[PDB]
Amino acid sequence: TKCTLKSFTVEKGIYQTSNFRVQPTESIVRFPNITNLCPFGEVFNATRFASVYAWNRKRISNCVADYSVLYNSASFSTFKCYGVSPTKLNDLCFTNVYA
């Protein structure tokens, strides 16, 4: 009360100082149980790539995507994520990924 009124002496009354809120007791993390790794290798290490005018699209689904292997590698000269942060990619689930 003293620090919310900014006075070493506070006269009688009822003063609102702060807000009481319960704190979480346990941390719950939920995800679907899928084991197979996403076949990123067949995309980045593909022997042949399609011409830009006919850019290839691959559907990535029903797999675990360890994006760290991608953004911790030194093999890429440009890595730019728009609307997402690459570090956060390990804590997100996507609808249906396309490469």
Ligand X SMILES: *[C@@H]1O[C@H](CO)[C@@H](O)[C@H](O)[C@H]1NC(C)=O
Min separation Cβ 19 and another protein, Å: 6
How many chain residues bind another protein (CB under 8 A)? 31
- Check if the beta carbon of residue 71 is closer than 8 Å to that of residue 40: no
Torsion over CA: 51, 55, 59, 63 (sign): positive
Closest residue by Cα to residue 60 from 32, 41, 40: 40
- Measured from the CB atom, the residue of 1 and 68 that comes closer to ligand X is 68
Binding-site ranges for ligand X (CB under 6 A)? 33, 40-41, 44-45
Contact footprint for another protein (CB under 8 A)? 1, 4, 8-22, 24, 28, 30-33, 83-85, 87-88, 91-93
